[PDB]
Design a protein around this ligand. Structure first.
Ligand SMILES: CC[C@H](C)[C@H](NC(=O)OCc1ccccc1)C(=O)N[C@@H](CC(C)C)C(=O)O
Ligand SMILES: CC[C@H](C)[C@H](NC(=O)OCc1ccccc1)C(=O)N[C@@H](CC(C)C)C(=O)O
Ligand SMILES: CC[C@H](C)[C@H](NC(=O)OCc1ccccc1)C(=O)N[C@@H](CC(C)C)C(=O)O
Ligand SMILES: CC[C@H](C)[C@H](NC(=O)OCc1ccccc1)C(=O)N[C@@H](CC(C)C)C(=O)O
Ligand SMILES: CC[C@H](C)[C@H](NC(=O)OCc1ccccc1)C(=O)N[C@@H](CC(C)C)C(=O)O
Ligand SMILES: CC[C@H](C)[C@H](NC(=O)OCc1ccccc1)C(=O)N[C@@H](CC(C)C)C(=O)O
Ligand SMILES: CC[C@H](C)[C@H](NC(=O)OCc1ccccc1)C(=O)N[C@@H](CC(C)C)C(=O)O
Ligand SMILES: CC[C@H](C)[C@H](NC(=O)OCc1ccccc1)C(=O)N[C@@H](CC(C)C)C(=O)O
Ligand SMILES: CC[C@H](C)[C@H](NC(=O)OCc1ccccc1)C(=O)N[C@@H](CC(C)C)C(=O)O
Ligand SMILES: *C(=O)/C=C/C[C@@H](C)CC
Ligand SMILES: *C(=O)/C=C/C[C@@H](C)CC
Ligand SMILES: *C(=O)/C=C/C[C@@H](C)CC
Ligand SMILES: *C(=O)/C=C/C[C@@H](C)CC
Ligand SMILES: *C(=O)/C=C/C[C@@H](C)CC
Ligand SMILES: *C(=O)/C=C/C[C@@H](C)CC
Lengths: 173, 6, 196, 174, 197, 195, 172, 174, 196, 197, 6, 6, 6, 6, 6
């Protein structure tokens, strides 16, 4: 019932792994909040392990299209989509708590079926992978080359380390 | 069992 | 339950298993899916028949669902390595990997029974393998290599071009004995020897 | 969960999961009820879906066509199978897609069981459905039936831009 | 538990298994469902009896639920290939695939016991196979071939027209020994050889 | 664990299993439920004892829960086929299928031990078979045939009318040794040879 | 909550396989609707795989006993009871969507127990089978011989094919 | 369950189970909402907990420190792992404990998986977290980092009195 | 099912297993994943062939998915300990641990069949091991030693620098027969000996 | 699959298993976790080699994860009891219990292969044992006895003080061959005997 | 089963 | 299957 | 595989 | 492993 | 174990 109190404050909370169910509700909430008042900012509090990309990008698109600025706060942890959506926030309004930890890494899929089917699955992996690194490079301001290099293996950032890398603009004292 | 089986 | 029979000569008496009698006649029997176990057993058998009489032909009877790729190429290389010619006979089916082994016999000595069937399709993965895109990118790369390699090997034994095989193997292609003969997988179809 | 109720007031229905009979029944009902309130105003269908059963999907499609009002379709996260079909089934010119939305189109997937006689019948229907799906997808996209059948053989993915070209959606949303 | 017995002659002593004694007499026993395991064993046994005495008849005792199609045609081809005539005897039942093997014996040498039964039905798939319509279209095509092939093979051995077989096999058809004789699946029905009777 | 014993004669030494010694005496032991496995083994044993000495009687010791119908008729036909007379002896019970096999011994040679029991009932299906009514109509038709066929077989061996068998087998009927003798399933009851 | 809005419109929806639970509710709804107004028609929307006959006929009987006409709409699919209840609608008020598919086939039971018990179960199979074919013949207007023949194996009908065979009167 | 709503009116939030993301988010929200209503009044956190994940735990900790109002911490049944940390993280002088409450302090517990390369990375973080936890626990208790690390090597239990002396809590409740 | 064959000489008759015939010819067969069971058996076999004829080469046929580290180094040390040279032959694949054993053969005597493949990757842990940071710190320390040790071992046998090995093994690297030869894992690739 | 080989002399032919040949050479192989089964088998083997030639050294090859405490002390006592000296060799690892057995060999005869490793840790209980505090008080007491008893045995064989062992075993300590030699668990590290090298 | 099988 | 295999 | 292994 | 074990 | 068992 507390989440309802937050919604009145124009705060939406991503507290779990990103999936279609959470994404749909989140997209809706953003549209509804933008419908009520398009001037006021929307704040997204993020504590998440990460989740599916398709659902994650559904959230991302809705953020961009929203008239108002979207402020992102990293509470406990931001990983995968958690990190992506965090960095996707309106520049200067991206926040992180002191002990918040950010994780950035390469995408994780799976392959199955005939060699013909797998070849297609591999094609898409290349499409997604390139697009993720492209946008992450834009958010952080790092070269696409470094994002790809750093993302090869899990790379953890503290609030300070994340601040320097360009994931978040401010740390909250 | 003889007688007679067997 | 498989019965054992008995043979006798002036030199002595011999109790033997039906499959042993076949191996005495230089007949290796592949009756099961191809795996590391089955492959190792077949390779061992081939090298033995090689050792005993390298000049005499070796016979491979094939009834199989098919099986693993590495296991198939293990058997394939051994077949081609051995100095002796290799005759392949298909009973009731040869599918996927087994279809390649059937075709991998030495030219002219590849045959099948009339009601046998032959299945050819591209390599498939039934389960799901997961990991980072970098790992999957490598697996997918290998999988395409294994596909193309199956296509090339089938191509030279059947005589068809690799491009033709690739088109035919895109979907499962079932072939009767005669249809398999025309495709170039087998040279002849055995006819019943019964008198009546 | 209360947000879906708020959307309904805005004449927005949301398909957020795989298409099944349960969801289809609810979606069809909502469309009829919305058309009853006001038949002039458009209805918006937001689509993020993996796809689902054809039979359940066509119950939705039929209801869309019969509705007096226009049906606008938005591809949010993903549109696949019935997701792609219903997306393209939207009123022409009112079909929208988000920038990173992905559309999947492919051949139908059934299963066969029972006696050779029963399977023979199941195969007959497969031919019927397959033709009908390709026909309508050809009509929605404006592509020839031959290309739909050819492209649908294996999974074919479209980006927002690629989908825009193929005729699945008319607009991309800025 | 299966007991082993002992035989003796001036040449030596022999301890043997009942199934070995049957095979010594050129009797192959099919007691189980037809599968790759059972099929390979029967083919091996047939080819052996071929090697030892190709001029002497081979006998097949059949009590079976039936089994796989590829496995059936493997045995069938081997039966027909072998130079020796093949006698088939049905004990207690021969069903589906097994009924074909029963009928596949050489003419006049196909027989059954009086209370044995024979089942004939079209090929069926108990489970479900899934995939794209392109794949199912191919499987369904093959399935029809296997159906028709069972009908043609049954037709020439029974003497019935393939069309009649197709009609009768649409649903499960159970036949007694005598009914199987009339159908043309077996030539004769064995009579009790007992002395007291 | 079953111990093996040892026998010796001027011709040599023989180590043998108790069940082998029984079979050496022309005794087939059915100790288990009747199934495709058990049926095939018994048929093999019968045909062997036929081969060795077709003129000498064969003995069947029966302790069984019963079993499948096809498996029963497989054993039954083989019993009736063999030239040698067949003696049947029941130990501790013969139920369902086994009761028929007990009664199927040649007349006068069917017997049982005093505390043994005999169960007779109509064929039953524990599980469920499903399908179109056309299929069930055929299955149900066959099932009735098998029922009547068990009734016919019991009838000629017991001497009772098929109608009586049908009436008695509608429900499970348990018979003592003496009760089975009166019913016509066995000819005699073995008596203790002790003091 | 939409079903409540439909009930106000005198629309009841059969969206799943027919069982006792749904049947009781459907029968109840029909009786209550007929109690409020016996003049106004009741509409039954059908998307169903089919289900048990006994539960299905409870619905059918209630439809017939109702004073008001019962209009039947085939939405996604009508199979087994779905097809039966669809065709059982008031003649001329039976409707179908364009891509709705109708499946008609022979009944499917099961047997268990003693041969005596199975004999009884088989008796009932013949009883039900005749009654189903009779009513299906009445609805479609086809001869019982053709109903029995066509129902032997699964027979699928499109909306157009269903219209000709006599399952539904109109296509929307 | 209706009592927690009644406690919230008294500005009392209750941590009654192991610390996870679900509970942490709810607790953080409540703290922010309570501070929004009135930033002058203290917030009381009643703690009976076995402990839980660090990430979720630190989210709570940060929210405490950033809050304008003081956070009073009460150890009711048990304080272990994060329970002990959050207990000691309370405003100095406003940290309370019941007489029979028991406090457990120990080294962090992680896990490692994957390739040797991945494990090397996982191990890097272990060193980072461990130092920080010991640093703050040393700050809360007022003990040297050297003694915290030594005592934290194995599970170390404190009674209310022992915890009072060690510096976890300022008062015991009579 | 593996058939047994029969050999005869003036001295007597011998019934033997194909795998026994291979061992009679000084051929050890590693056909399975490397584990404590398989390792102990191979070490035993190695020491026997050492005992019988220490001056004659020992042959190792390898088709394996790979396996445990301790099991690998157990076999490795035993291979290197034995006085006799060791020939390694790869059939159908040698992966992970097995790839190291393949390379551990004595120089010049390492070979593979044409369609065989070789997989190399860094050591991995499929499950999860849990405990206090102090314990994980120790496990992690050992794991790095094992990683570096595999790199060093591969380095001296292949001839590549340890740094190169570390880079290539970060991700799974599949090698064909020829690719394995160039990498330095095997010395030569066997060519088909067939007469026809 | 483990192949059997064949040896021949003027006296006859001998077909034997590799492990039999090792035992013929007085080599006991511990390849598995230490348990009552493995312990009983090893004790039997030790007492046999005692019986046959008590004056000749016995060899123990050790590759083991370790195992139960009682099972270990069963093997340990038997090793020390036997009149013959015992050589211990470690292949690929000796862990926990096995490390003690490795160290329990007679001085100078304890060795390992170069890439073998050795694990030492205090006794641990993987599962959970429940009961009244009185029962747990006893279990906890016994566990401490077994810990301390492991420390004393390791102490006298390695030469280290019991207190040092306790300190080192508090956390798992992995040792390479050379590190195990320095610790005093083994006397020497085997060097490769190869001719080509 | 002889005569005649075998 | 001789002739000719084998 | 001789020559040369073995 | 001789010398010296055994 | 001798002496004395056995
Ligand atoms: C738990 C991981 C999750 C399953 C996966 N997402 C994932 O791995 O996201 C990580 C990420 C990295 C960079 C930027 C954003 C996100 C995913 O959506 N995979 C898709 C990939 C597909 C869209 C190609 C899938 O296979 O379902
Ligand atoms: C894309 C499928 C792949 C070729 C293989 N599947 C596979 O062997 O499928 C059967 C098959 C079909 C046609 C021809 C040969 C074999 C597999 O994954 N097995 C691999 C292991 C895997 C890690 C690639 C193996 O057997 O080594
Ligand atoms: C998960 C797939 C699903 C089961 C299947 N649908 C399906 O495969 O839809 C794919 C599609 C293609 C083109 C346009 C729209 C959708 C289906 O409805 N199959 C039916 C059979 C069909 C002949 C109606 C069923 O088996 O239930
Ligand atoms: C339509 C059923 C098909 C003929 C077969 N089923 C099958 O063999 O059913 C038993 C049977 C009945 C009558 C006569 C012969 C056999 C099957 O699917 N088995 C195949 C595999 C499948 C991929 C076709 C096999 O055993 O090879
Ligand atoms: C109505 C029951 C039927 C006779 C049989 N059950 C069956 O054998 O029940 C035991 C039994 C009781 C009395 C006498 C004989 C046997 C069965 O279904 N078994 C059949 C298979 C089934 C498809 C008819 C078999 O074993 O062949
Ligand atoms: C899944 C099918 C379902 C179980 C079956 N119904 C069923 O198969 O209905 C099909 C149908 C066909 C034509 C006309 C009406 C209906 C049924 O209720 N059978 C009854 C039969 C019994 C009343 C004799 C039952 O076994 O419960
Ligand atoms: C109760 C076990 C729990 C899994 C673990 N927490 C944990 O062990 O917290 C104990 C603690 C120690 C010192 C000070 C405060 C608390 C944890 O979060 N571990 C993290 C470690 C990671 C942040 C490096 C994880 O592996 O998920
Ligand atoms: C980091 C993984 C580790 C090297 C090992 N995994 C392992 O052996 O992975 C297979 C492997 C790959 C490449 C080279 C050699 C082996 C493992 O954990 N097995 C250990 C036990 C573990 C406690 C270290 C063993 O088998 O002894
Ligand atoms: C505290 C652990 C205890 C020493 C033992 N565990 C145990 O044997 O762990 C392995 C081990 C480690 C180091 C040294 C020797 C062995 C156990 O509970 N096993 C006992 C039974 C138990 C009731 C004490 C046994 O095997 O006798
Ligand atoms: C009845 O007395 C049976 C005796 C068995 C004997 C003939 C052979 C063990
Ligand atoms: C038919 O009488 C069969 C008899 C089997 C016999 C020839 C060998 C056991
Ligand atoms: C083909 O006729 C095969 C016969 C097998 C025979 C040579 C040995 C059992
Ligand atoms: C390579 O040709 C190996 C042959 C094996 C042979 C020496 C013994 C079976
Ligand atoms: C060390 O070299 C051990 C060798 C074993 C040998 C004495 C007997 C197989
Ligand atoms: C005690 O030393 C026991 C020794 C066993 C020996 C007598 C026989 C293996």
């Amino acid at each position: 019932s507390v989440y309802e109190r937050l919604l009145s404050e124009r705060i939406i909370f991503l507290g779990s792994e990103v999936n279609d169910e959470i994404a749909n509700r989140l997209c809706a909430q953003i549209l509804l909040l933008a419908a009520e008042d398009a001037s006021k900012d929307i704040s997204l509090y993020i504590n998440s392990p990460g989740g599916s990309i398709s659902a994650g990008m559904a959230i991302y698109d809705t953020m961009v299209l929203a008239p108002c600025d979207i402020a992102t706060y990293a509470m406990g942890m931001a990983a995968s989509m958690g990190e992506f959506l965090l960095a996707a926030g309106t520049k200067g309004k991206r926040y992180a708590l002191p002990h918040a930890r950010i994780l950035m890494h390469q995408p994780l899929g799976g392959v199955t079926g005939s060699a013909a089917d797998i070849a297609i699955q591999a094609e898409q992996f290349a499409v997604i992978k390139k697009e993720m690194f492209r946008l992450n490079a834009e958010f952080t301001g790092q070269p696409i080359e470094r994002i790809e290099a750093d993302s090869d293996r899990d790379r953890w950032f503290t609030a300070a380390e994340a601040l320097e890398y360009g994931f978040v603009d401010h740390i909250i004292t | 069992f003889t007688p007679x089986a067997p | 339950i498989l019965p054992s029979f008995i043979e006798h000569s002036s030199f002595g008496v011999k109790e033997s298993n039906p499959y042993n009698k076949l191996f005495e006649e230089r007949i290796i029997f592949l009756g099961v899916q191809v795996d590391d176990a089955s492959a190792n057993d077949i390779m061992a058998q081939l090298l033995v028949l090689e050792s005993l009489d390298p000049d005499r032909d070796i016979t491979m009877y094939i009834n199989s669902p098919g099986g693993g790729f590495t296991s198939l190429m293990a058997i394939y290389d051994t077949m081609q390595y051995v100095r002796a010619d290799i005759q392949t006979v298909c009973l009731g089916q040869a599918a996927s990997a087994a279809a390649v082994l059937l075709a991998a016999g030495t030219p002219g000595k590849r045959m099948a029974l009339p009601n046998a069937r032959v299945l050819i399709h591209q390599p498939s993965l039934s389960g799901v393998i997961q990991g980072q895109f970098s790992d999957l990118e490598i697996q997918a790369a290998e999988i395409e290599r294994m596909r193309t390699l199956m296509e090339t090997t089938l191509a030279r034994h059947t005589g068809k071009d690799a491009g033709v095989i690739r088109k035919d193997t895109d979907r499962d292609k079932i072939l009767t004995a005669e249809e398999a003969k025309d495709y170039g997988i087998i040279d002849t179809v055995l006819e019943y020897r019964k008198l009546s």
